[PDB]
Amino acid sequence: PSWPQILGRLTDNRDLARGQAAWAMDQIMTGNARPAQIAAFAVAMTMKAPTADEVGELAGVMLSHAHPLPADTVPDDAVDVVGTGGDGVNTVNLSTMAAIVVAAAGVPVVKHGNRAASSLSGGADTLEALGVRIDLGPDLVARSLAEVGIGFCFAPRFHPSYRHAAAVRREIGVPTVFNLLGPLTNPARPRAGLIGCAFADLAEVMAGVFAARRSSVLVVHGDDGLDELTTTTTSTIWRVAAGSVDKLTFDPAGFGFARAQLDQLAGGDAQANAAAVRAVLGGARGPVRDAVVLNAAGAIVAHAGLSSRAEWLPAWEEGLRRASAAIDTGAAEQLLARWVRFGRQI
Ligand SMILES: O=P(O)(O)OC[C@H]1O[C@H](OP(=O)(O)OP(=O)(O)O)[C@H](O)[C@@H]1O
Ligand SMILES: [Mg+2]
Ligand SMILES: [Mg+2]
Secondary structure: OOHHHHHHHHHOOOOOOOOHHHHHHHHHHOOOOOHHHHHHHHHHHHHOOOOHHHHHHHHHHHHHHOOOOOOOOOOOOOEEEEEOOOOOOOEOOHHHHHHHHHHHOOOOEEEEEOOOOOOOOOHHHHHHHOOOOOOOOHHHHHHHHHHHOEEEEEHHHHOOOOOOHHHHHHHHOOOOHHHOOHHHOOOOOOOEEEEEOOOHHHHHHHHHHHHHHOOEEEEEEEOOOOOOOOOOOOEEEEEEEOOEEEEEEEOHHHHOOOOOOHHHHEOOOHHHHHHHHHHHHOOOOOHHHHHHHHHHHHHHHHHHOOOOOOOHHHHHHHHHHHHHHHHHOOHHHHHHHHHHHHHHOO
16 A cells, blocks of 8 residues: 555545555554654544444554553453543543443443543543542553452553654644544453444444454444433444444433433533542432433443343343442442552552
8 A cells, every 4th residue: 555545545535445544554653654644644534434444444553552451351341431522512421430330330341541632521530530540551450450340541551652643633733533443442452342422423333343343332322412321312322242233222211211401411620520420429319320320331231242142121221220239339439439549559
């Protein structure tokens, strides 16, 4: 492949041929691209409708340059709970709340992430405000997992940057498709996940890449535009299991959830979010606790999906019950406290 060949295909409004997105992303990752080639490719790839073949290639290459966790340190049934973000709603850190609740229910959670992209407070900022050590290395993430039930892979720590990245990001000033692939590049490679996507067309595509990984994932988009399962309206779920994709509309009303408003699910900065967490984990009832329950239960359903004999409404009932129980028994609050102690004693 070559730059003019790939770049010309893109400016011609064609999809890339097999191997070209990978070759391109790998030239960038090994320090073989000029800033103009980098910016051109990334931008053109942010504008063209995504496909599963190109997206799998970009993510596959990125994931090959990531730092793995030590051998046999990720349980088979580990889950991620993570969104692309990019949904411009500035919500309350639903994912990180759900992740603690999932882990407190007993399902291993290995998440990655970073600081906010455009939100007031990203999951990582919010963890940090709660006292949680965001910057552990592959060894201590693996001990976190083993001794707390949850580990957090900080993105800058697990994914190398590339030559010219700071100049390019500065100069272009916008996120690109390079920034939307996180769900697909978790360094621990959990096989289960609740994956929220702000862009429906990217989500469906990402559901196909997961499907081929044999992962058990619910890829989710609020029909209100949330990158989470929403309590405001229905959501679209691309339920991935046994190598196939089952796209369906989901209404949490089928399980007794009251309709909320977007306003009620809104976040603030890292302290405001850190306090919203303590409230929910301490028992505060309301629209936020509900959205947390719902997405936690979703992740538990993705987890149930690792057995071929999972049934949907029973997985869900059991997920809602386990997520609510984790809050109400104090398990989630006790886990957060344990997570804070862990990092402090190194
Ligand atoms: O700034 P934005 O582009 O809106 O994105 C907000 C955050 O959401 C994503 O993570 P995740 O889904 O894990 O975070 P959450 O806990 O806030 O849902 C991403 O890692 C950001 O940290
Ligand atoms: Mg999220
Ligand atoms: Mg979100």
